[PDB]
Amino acid sequence: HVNGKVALVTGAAQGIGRAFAEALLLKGAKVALVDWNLEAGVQCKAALDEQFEPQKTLFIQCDVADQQQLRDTFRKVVDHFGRLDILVNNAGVNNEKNWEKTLQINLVSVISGTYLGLDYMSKQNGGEGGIIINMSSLAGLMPVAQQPVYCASKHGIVGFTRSAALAANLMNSGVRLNAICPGFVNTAILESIEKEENMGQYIEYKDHIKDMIKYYGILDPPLIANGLITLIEDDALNGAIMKITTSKGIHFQDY
Amino acid sequence: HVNGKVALVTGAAQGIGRAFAEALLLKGAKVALVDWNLEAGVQCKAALDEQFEPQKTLFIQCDVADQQQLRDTFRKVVDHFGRLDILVNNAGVNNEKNWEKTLQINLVSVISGTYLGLDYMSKQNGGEGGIIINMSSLAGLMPVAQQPVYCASKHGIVGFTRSAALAANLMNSGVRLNAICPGFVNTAILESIEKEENMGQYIEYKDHIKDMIKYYGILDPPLIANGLITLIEDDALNGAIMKITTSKGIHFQDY
Ligand SMILES: NC(=O)c1ccc[n+]([C@@H]2O[C@H](COP(=O)([O-])OP(=O)(O)OC[C@H]3O[C@@H](n4cnc5c(N)ncnc54)[C@H](O)[C@@H]3O)[C@@H](O)[C@H]2O)c1
Ligand SMILES: NC(=O)c1ccc[n+]([C@@H]2O[C@H](COP(=O)([O-])OP(=O)(O)OC[C@H]3O[C@@H](n4cnc5c(N)ncnc54)[C@H](O)[C@@H]3O)[C@@H](O)[C@H]2O)c1
Ligand SMILES: Cn1nc2cc(N3CCOc4cc(C(=O)N5CCC(F)(F)CC5)ccc43)ccn2c1=O
Ligand SMILES: Cn1nc2cc(N3CCOc4cc(C(=O)N5CCC(F)(F)CC5)ccc43)ccn2c1=O
């Protein structure tokens, strides 16, 4: 189901997004790597081009929270690769200080990107259907005392995705929407909990998170990519909230 | 436990917010009615003045989604009444068409209002503690096919409020933060499901909501206000997610 498909992955320069790009590439997708960090993107594209044919990937610099630029980016992806099959709204930040920007990136941009994915992929517009995967977190399901707004953002993604999936069935768009909710993942974002710039008033309680990181353990990005691929290959999965934890592996929130 | 306390209720001009204001007035609070609807707000305070003493209420016109107005409105309330004890972040809209505004109103404003509430009320800032109640919805706990962004916003409030409650404990702020998640309530917002202006692309699916309304029935605003009073009066309730249904009345989400 993945071979020959065109995926747009936001936040693809590193971490989970990069892992998605690699997993999709390994299974024969073409991937637009979309990220606001041009330097990390360049390095990512360089590394991918050592493992994959260059025609298989495209780097586009975009701040997903800039809606005009996001729209431009979708236009570029479809102009470059001719179609869109898979959208992964993966970009996210931890910033409890500039918390409005956290909401803009983590939630608003997931909704706007989702809506663009439906415009490009819905059968209602003559598309072939497709899949949209949105990156939530266990923080989308349970509280995080040291990051309430991050928590808010990931909760929003759960409710939004479950609802949009239901609406997709009703509209016969042919688009399946699912969300992934990882435990801690071994990526650079974990570093953010050390910085008053990112934690603001919550910086003083950062060691509680550091303890949870060690006691729950951390997930390898490839494992999340495995979850991604599962979602993409199983066309029964719509509205699914996929949980990935070190203890229970890849499973689902039941409602 | 309520007598002589100062309450700020957003969305106070009508609906659940008006019910909160009345319930609080009945229990001896002073209430700042904050709402963007000048006409409704003026008539609300006029109606309240016929039943309660005029000095117990202050109407302030404010778009809560305008953070500068919100901040200013907080300053005017505390200047007028001399302190803040109870913040009810109750304003919300249903608008899946200009869904960015819906997030600004339903989620951004709840967080910014909460943060303002804590600025005044936290012990660590020279406050004497108090309570913040956020208005979620059952849409904060489950999907709504015909209003995905409303759902996202209400989910956001649940994640935010449970998280901030835990933080308030860590920080010994002396503030309790709870959320209420009603089923359908007999207010003017129910009319919006009939309008393309509010429903946008989901307008064609509104009958499903209408069917749920007939299925579940409709709650009276005063019952919701009874839920508010329960939260204010019980100092053991922090991070509680109160559900109010026709079937079960006032109860709590168990996690
Ligand atoms: N790592 C974890 O523990 C964890 C757990 C649960 C969920 N998540 C979520 O997984 C997703 C991926 O994060 P990660 O762990 O790989 O972190 P990361 O910080 O290493 O990678 C995030 C990537 O997104 C990009 N990005 C951020 N804001 C952007 C914007 N406005 N426009 C474009 N690109 C932007 C960054 O430049 C970066 O390349 C995020 O949504 C994060 O919230 C992470
Ligand atoms: N009525 C329901 O079935 C139901 C169910 C669950 C939750 N809720 C929530 O209850 C709350 C109260 O809504 P309601 O049912 O009383 O509806 P309503 O439309 O009758 O009242 C909402 C009030 O909020 C005000 N408001 C809206 N946006 C504002 C803004 N930007 N700035 C200032 N004031 C603003 C409106 O002017 C109005 O007076 C909302 O948060 C709503 O989402 C309602
Ligand atoms: C059984 N079990 N339960 C849990 C609960 C987990 N939590 C609760 C605390 O905060 C979290 C944050 C994020 C999160 O998205 N992060 C980490 C902090 C950040 F880097 F800033 C942003 C990205 C994910 C999960 C959790 C984790 C593993 N867990 C597990 O294995
Ligand atoms: C057991 N049980 N389960 C449920 C589920 C309910 N739902 C799911 C569908 O949508 C909702 C919307 C709102 C909501 O906040 N609204 C209504 C629509 C609006 F006017 F536009 C905005 C404000 C509230 C609840 C529900 C309702 C009662 N329920 C019950 O009693």
Side-chain angles (χ1 to χ4, degrees), chain B residues 6-81:
Chain B
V6 175
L8 188 172
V9 178
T10 72
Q14 65 193 43
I16 296 169
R18 172 166 183 164
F20 287 166
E22 289 159 347
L24 292 157
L25 290 158
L26 283 172
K27 294 215 96 185
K30 302 184 166 87
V31 181
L33 314 161
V34 173
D35 203 287
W36 63 347
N37 184 334
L38 178 58
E39 189 163 343
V42 167
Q43 293 171 312
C44 179
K45 178 167 161 56
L48 297 181
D49 288 350
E50 288 176 48
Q51 178 186 345
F52 308 95
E53 290 183 79
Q55 75 286 354
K56 296 302 185 43
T57 49
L58 172 70
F59 173 71
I60 301 181
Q61 190 186 356
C62 178
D63 178 351
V64 296
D66 176 343
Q67 250 206 256
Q68 298 180 315
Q69 294 181 51
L70 189 57
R71 182 180 297 262
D72 193 57
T73 296
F74 273 73
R75 284 195 289 248
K76 282 173 158 47
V77 166
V78 165
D79 286 357
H80 180 87
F81 282 124

Side-chain angles (χ1 to χ4, degrees), chain A:
Chain A
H1 265 59
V2 172
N3 179 57
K5 300 291 148 49
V6 176
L8 195 168
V9 176
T10 75
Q14 69 193 45
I16 296 163
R18 173 161 177 180
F20 287 162
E22 289 168 356
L24 284 161
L25 284 170
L26 283 161
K27 307 215 89 210
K30 294 179 196 75
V31 183
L33 316 159
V34 172
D35 203 291
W36 65 353
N37 186 340
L38 170 61
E39 170 173 345
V42 167
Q43 181 49 239
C44 179
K45 172 55 175 161
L48 296 178
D49 282 346
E50 278 218 87
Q51 187 188 354
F52 306 104
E53 294 186 0
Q55 311 81 347
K56 293 309 189 53
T57 57
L58 172 64
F59 180 76
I60 302 165
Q61 190 175 22
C62 179
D63 175 357
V64 298
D66 178 343
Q67 196 178 304
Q68 171 153 351
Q69 203 183 20
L70 187 62
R71 293 155 69 184
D72 190 58
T73 292
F74 273 75
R75 293 195 303 266
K76 286 166 166 19
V77 172
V78 165
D79 186 58
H80 186 75
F81 284 123
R83 59 197 280 118
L84 179 63
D85 299 296
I86 297 158
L87 169 68
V88 184
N89 292 303
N90 161 82
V93 296
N94 168 44
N95 189 348
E96 290 297 313
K97 186 171 194 186
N98 190 358
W99 59 264
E100 285 178 79
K101 181 178 177 206
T102 297
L103 281 174
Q104 283 294 321
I105 300 166
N106 284 16
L107 175 61
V108 171
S109 300
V110 162
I111 300 163
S112 67
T114 288
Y115 280 158
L116 279 169
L118 293 173
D119 291 334
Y120 280 96
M121 285 192 309
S122 179
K123 286 177 172 178
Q124 290 325 289
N125 294 335
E128 282 173 63
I131 174 171
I132 298 171
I133 294 144
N134 294 325
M135 282 302 306
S136 186
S137 169
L138 285 187
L141 287 183
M142 70 182 56
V144 183
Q146 293 82 359
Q147 53 194 347
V149 177
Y150 181 82
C151 182
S153 80
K154 296 304 199 173
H155 276 63
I157 291 170
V158 166
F160 175 64
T161 299
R162 295 186 65 200
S163 303
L166 290 175
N169 281 343
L170 291 181
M171 288 168 178
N172 191 43
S173 70
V175 178
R176 299 188 285 126
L177 296 91
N178 299 294
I180 297 171
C181 293
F184 304 115
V185 190
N186 194 7
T187 76
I189 204 172
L190 301 181
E191 294 172 2
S192 68
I193 65 173
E194 301 283 6
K195 293 162 178 187
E196 183 284 340
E197 183 180 8
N198 292 84
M199 292 293 285
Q201 60 188 316
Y202 305 104
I203 191 51
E204 297 296 78
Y205 313 95
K206 81 174 199 301
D207 293 351
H208 169 31
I209 308 184
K210 297 183 58 153
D211 286 334
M212 297 183 269
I213 286 169
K214 291 286 189 286
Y215 68 67
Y216 286 128
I218 56 176
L219 293 158
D220 209 25
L223 196 29
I224 315 300
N226 296 347
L228 185 91
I229 296 300
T230 289
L231 293 173
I232 298 172
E233 282 166 354
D234 183 349
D235 77 357
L237 297 175
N238 181 45
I241 306 299
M242 168 179 279
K243 300 185 287 164
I244 308 178
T245 65
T246 58
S247 58
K248 287 171 80 183
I250 299 171
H251 62 293
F252 297 87
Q253 185 54 64
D254 305 303
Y255 288 104

